[PDB]
Each structure stands twice: as C-alpha cells, then as structure tokens.
C-alpha cells in the first residue's frame with residue numbers, strides 16, 4: 410500500500426506498447442480520483458472519475474497546457490464503485506491512450522501532447538487506497 414498522492418516516474422516518457430497498471434481500492438465515501446500524465450507542468454492526459462457531479466457519476470478526460478484546461482471528453486460508463494478494488498490499465502498506442510478498468514475496455518483519448526517521450530510522470534490522487542502502480546512493455 411502506498412500514500413496518495415503518489416508520483417510514478419515514467420523515465421524517458423511513454424511509448425506504444427507501454428501498459429501502466431494502477432491497483433487500488435475506492436474509499437467508501439469517494440468523491441473523485443485523478444490520474445495525471447504530466448509533461449512538466451502540462452497534463453497530457455487527465456483521467457478523472459467523479460462520483461457526485463450533479464448526483465451523476467461521470468469520467469472526465471482533459472489536457473492542461475500552460476495551466477489552462479482544454480476541451481473535456483466525458484464518459485458515463487463508470488466501472489468504479491465506492492469500497493471496491495479496481496485495476497486501471499492505460500495502454501499507450503501510437504495515436505491514443507486506451508483505458509481498460511477491471512479488464513473491460515472503457516475509453517480512448519487521442520494524443521493532444523505529441524512529445525510522448527517527455528510525459529515523464531504519472532500523478533495518482535484522490536479518494537483511493539493505492540495498492541500498486543507499475544508499467545511493463547507488452
């Protein structure tokens with residue numbers, strides 16, 4: 410078990426066939442989770458489950474450039490449950506991040522930040538107990 414917020418270094422950034430696995434349990438009164446794939450201060454890929462946005466559950470994805478949030482991509486398919494263990498897998502492909510939760514495909518997010526080899530940190534934060542965060546080459 411790790412202390413959140415947690416920074417996972419991604420040395421030399423990400424590359425196609427890099428599979429990032431995040432294992433954790435959602436806290437019982439969860440409001441939000443965030444994965445932030447960072448290129449310095451920019452967020453190439455913000456993955457943000459929201460448990461209570463207007464009494465709905467939604468996943469918000471976005472990019473932050475020069476400290477400005479861009480256009481949101483939203484997904485109502487919401488595989489997280491308060492109190493339950495999850496696995497998030499982010500598979501880097503040539504043109505998008507592919508996200509599967511609990512071995513079920515969830516969403517794709519097209520690369521807005523092009524410099525994948527400079528996306529050198531993943532921030533993990535929010536209402537989770539973090540069990541592990543790691544990556545491998547498939």
Ligand SMILES: CO[C@@H]1O[C@H](CO)[C@H](O)[C@H](OC(=O)c2ccc(C)cc2)[C@@H]1OC(=O)c1ccccc1[N+](=O)[O-]
Pocket residue numbers: 440441442455457458459461462469470471478479481
């Ligand atoms: C102004 O809205 C932004 O949309 C951005 C993407 O487009 C980011 O999701 C932003 O999240 C943050 O940057 C953020 C929020 C809180 C903390 C502690 C750290 C970062 C932020 O999101 C929120 O603050 C937010 C708004 C409504 C419901 C739930 C949340 N939320 O889960 O924080």
Ligand SMILES: [Cl-]
Pocket residue numbers: 521522523524
């Ligand atoms: Cl870029």
